[PDB]
């Protein structure tokens with residue numbers, strides 16, 4: 001099967017670092033330089049073996065054809081009103097980028113407002129963030145190129161879709177918040193740095209500042225409103241209160257759901273926004289999250305996890321701000337996580353809960369917190385919403401494993417509420433009645449019950465004969481909830497597979513306690529949980545190790561890579577997308593310093609001792625047993641992934657190929673593909689998405705020798 005040779009890759013045997021008395025050799029450290037001829041040549045040599053391997057068998061083209069056909073369905077966002085007009089996103093089916101439309105009424109003719117497709121030949125310029133002025137007459141939007149986190153902000157006048165001269169550079173991880181006087185907008189920027197800032201660099205991002213841009217001026221005139229020069233990792237994002245009176249500053253340091261919350265009463269500024277604002281440091285620590293919902297005068301409603309790991313709503317009165325005085329508007333639930341909250345039609349709240357990994361949606365009274373109405377939903381996720389305080393209606397979008405999506409609408413001016421289907425699309429070719437979704441709870445090593453969704457064809461025999469695709473993430477308070485994936489349903493229908501999603505610890509599925517169960521000293525719980533999900537699928541007869549593929553991205557790429565090292569006997573195939581692989585060095589690059597809240601940092605002996613045990617780069621080892629080799633492995637990354645710098649995958653693949661790939665018993669391939677004009681994934685154009693899933697499933701099909709089922 002392996003009619004190629006791995007490229008020769010220089011080992012710098014002098015690259016040795018002492019970590020608290022533990023010597024670590026890093027012979028591929030040179031791959032950390034993305035601009036070197038050595039690194040470029042490495043990437044070319046790797047792509048030269050991977051691409052023909054993936055393209056060789058007709059199955060890739062069969063998959064690509066079916067993906068192109070089945071993914072070709074109309075895709076809408078929720079409608080949202082801004083000022084006098086309605087907006088929505090829409091993709092006719094296979095456009096590289098969805099397009100923003102505008103209409104003067106719900107019943108009126110729609111026209112194109114912003115079409116990112118016309119900004120590049122290949123769909124590699126994408127919208128990344130936007131904000132309308134409070135009156136809806138002006139529009140700011142971020143553009144990213146080739147999938148980088150870097151943003152350029154541009155501006156338009158809404159009436160006539162007129163491009164304006166204003167351009168803001170050096171924007172990354174930024175807020176966008178207009179003052180209600182319409183004069184200008186808050187945003188974030190980084191100071192100038194040596195080298196490139198295009199997404200190919202690895203330079204750490206520090207000293208983010210908060211600026212205010214006056215519309216009709218040059219960026220060089222922008223006002224500095226907040227900075228933290230003694231705290232280079234702090235990031236202060238601004239929003240205006242719903243009445244326009246207060247700027248709320250949420251300061252973050254790291255990825256934990258916590259923030260400082262300062263405010264500026266804009267009426268108290270001596271002469272408008274002229275410099276550093278008169279911040280009042282309401283919550284001046286990182287002990288809890290305070291997410292603004294709405295205010296009525298000085299009474300501010302926040303969603304919080306302060307002493308409430310499943311989240312709750314509190315009211316803080318700025319005129320009586322001591323914690324003993326806060327009112328608990330909607331108390332914490334014993335098990336269900338309050339995921340997000342919105343205020344609509346002045347005095348309603350819309351609360352979205354997660355109940356055993358499925359969403360529910362409720363309308364409550366702002367004054368008392370009392371439940372008023374349950375919006376009925378099938379089992380799945382709410383993935384879109386609109387309805388702000390001054391608006392009188394809501395839209396929300398529902399999705400599930402088997403359903404592409406339904407957008408509902410509810411007119412909240414009516415005495416009796418009747419939510420109605422507003423938009424629905426059906427994908428022909430995937431008959432949902434042929435399949436089922438089950439949720440089970442399996443015990444992990446330590447006895448904790450972990451949820452898992454399993455999607456499969458109705459009536460299958462549990463005889464271990466089916467290929468399986470088991471997905472996980474496990475970190476950062478991210479909940480892995482049901483979603484419609486044509487790419488995975490093709491695996492089910494056309495490759496006879498079983499899909500599984502394990503809700504392992506580190507995620508947000510059971511609130512902050514679930515997240516803390518998968519971080520820092522307890523990160524190994526993630527891996528144990530995931531290995532146990534695989535063991536369940538095998539024991540219960542869904543699959544067998546040789547037919548099992550595991551997949552994850554980013555922190556989920558770390559997940560599957562670590563699992564490959566720890567239990568190579570459990571998996572036939574491993575696809576790690578944009579994975580964090582070097583756990584000793586991740587904090588040195590771009591925004592990686594922010595991840596130490598989930599991982600720790602190797603500068604601490606205590607943390608090093610956790611990290612060294614599971615770091616994928618540092619745990620590649622030939623299996624002791626003669627009959628065990630590594631699973632087939634494919635790493636996918638891209639040359640502008642400035643979220644997870646691609647050196648992680650480059651150094652990992654070099655290590656896998658040298659330590660394991662050179663062994664006579666290893667016959668499963670260990671490959672990397674590095675894409676061009678792409679990044680971590682957000683904003684990836686449709687064409688590239690289709691190529692990527694075609695690569696993934698062709699790899700699975702060839703390695704496992706799975707026949708296509710037309």
Ligand SMILES: *[C@@H](N)[C@@H]1CCCN1C(=O)[C@@H]1C[C@H](n2cc(CNC(=O)OC(C)(C)C)nn2)CN1C(=O)CCCc1ccccc1
Pocket residue numbers: 173235252253254255473476478480553554555556580591594595643644
């Ligand atoms: C990928 N997981 C990378 C590497 C490890 C952490 N990480 C982040 O991007 C990190 C965690 C938060 N995050 C996770 C994701 C992943 N989403 C996802 O893949 O889920 C599916 C939809 C596929 C199921 N996206 N964001 C935030 N993130 C950051 O690094 C944010 C940087 C900016 C920032 C913002 C606020 C505070 C600090 C830093």
